[PDB]
Amino acid sequence: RPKVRDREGRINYYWTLLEPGDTIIFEANGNLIAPRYAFALSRGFGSGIINSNA
Amino acid sequence: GLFGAIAGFIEGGWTGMVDGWYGYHHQNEQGSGYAADQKSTQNAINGITNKVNSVIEKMNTQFTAVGKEFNKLERRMENLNKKVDDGFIDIWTYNAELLVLLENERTLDFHDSNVKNLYEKVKSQLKNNAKEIGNGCFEFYHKCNDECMESVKNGTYDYPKYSEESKLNREKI
């Protein structure tokens, strides 16, 4: 790939939500960027993001 | 109110008059009684009727399923739907309530109108043949039996027929 931050290679980033009781399973023979820390959160609802210098 | 007849110089209403919204009370020897002026009352019923039937009958509503169900990676869509529903509800609530307020005021003012205009209708027939006693009431100088009263009610009154007697009774007053 064209040099971005001087790097011809890439990492595609992926995420998902794991509800209680359910189990997530990773398997790999290579190219994995494993998780180290995850985020146990409760939801909240109906907000947005602000982009300003105030 | 806005014209000073209802709650204005006419302090209150006539619980005994069931013939309609607007009417008369006479006091000729033959006796008293209440009547209604069906012309103005009927025009008011037609107008108000048309108003209400205009706030109701104007609501076209297509067949619509308001509900939409989304999964856990469609929160943007779910909040968009929520945004549509909530927007319309805000609009209709605000506009509906202010509409009811404003048009209630307008209706009361319309009744006040009809009564004042009716008072003036009677006044313009009795210029010097009567005086303005109290409120919503005229006292005659010539005695006016039922026939004459029922004449004031249907518009025809015949003034010069009673002008002389009046000219007499008025001088000493």
- The pair of three-digit structure tokens given for residue B162, joined into one six-digit string: 């009673």
Beta-ladder partners of B131: B139
The position carrying tokens 């026939």 is B147
Minimum CA–CA partner of B76 in chain A: A46
Nearest-CA distance from A9 to chain B in Å?
Answer: 28
Nearest-CA distance from B6 to chain A in Å?
Answer: 52
Distances in Å between the Cα of B119 and the Cα atoms of B5, B17, B126, B155 are: 9, 17, 11, 12
Minimum CA–CA partner of A15 in chain B: B73
Paired sense of beta strands B137-140 and B34-36, if any? unpaired
Contacts with A17 from chain B: Cβ below 8 Å: 72
The closest of B46, B44, B50 to B114, measured between CA atoms, is B44
CB pairs under 8 A between A and B: 3
- The pair of three-digit structure tokens given for residue B156, joined into one six-digit string: 């025809």
Minimum CA–CA partner of A18 in chain B: B72
A residues 17..46 contacting B (CB < 8 A): 17, 46
**Helices B38-56 + B75-123 axis angle, to 10:** 170
Query: What whole-number distance in Å separates Cα of residue B19 and Cα of residue B39?
Result: 12
Q: Are B70 and B78 in contact (CB under 8 A)?
A: yes
Solved using: X-ray
**H, E, C per residue of chain B:** CCCCCECCCECCCCCCCCCCCCEEECCECCECCEEECHHHHHHHHHHHHHHHHHHHCCCCCCCCCCCCCCCCCCHHHHHHHHHHHHHHHHHHHHHHHHHHHHHHHHHHHHHHHHHHHHHHHHHCCCCCCEEEECCCEEEECCCCCHHHHHHHHCCCCCCCCCHHHHHHHHHHC
CATH number at residue B46: 3.90.20.10
Distances in Å between the Cα of B5 and the Cα atoms of A18, B9, B12, B126 are: 73, 5, 10, 19
Q: Are B51 and B103 in contact (CB under 8 A)?
A: yes
Instruction: Look at chain B and report how many structural domains it folds into.
Output: 1
- Contact at CB, A46 and B72, closer than 8 angstroms: no
Among the partner-chain residues B72, B79, B82, the one whose CB lies closest to the CB of A17 is B72
The DSSP string of A2-41 is: --SSS-S-----------TT-------SS-----S-----
Structural resolution in Å = 2.8
Question: In sequence order, which residues have a C-beta less than 8 Å from that of residue B140 and are 6 or more positions away?
Answer: B126, B129, B130, B166
- The pair of three-digit structure tokens given for residue B69, joined into one six-digit string: 């169900």
B residues 33..92 contacting A (CB < 8 A): 72, 79, 82
Instruction: Give break positions in chain A: residue before each, C–N beyond 2.5 Å.
Output: none
Question: In sequence order, which residues have a C-beta less than 8 Å from that of residue B35 and are 6 or more positions away?
Answer: B17, B19, B23, B24, B25, B26, B153
User: Domain residues for B24?
Assistant: 1-173
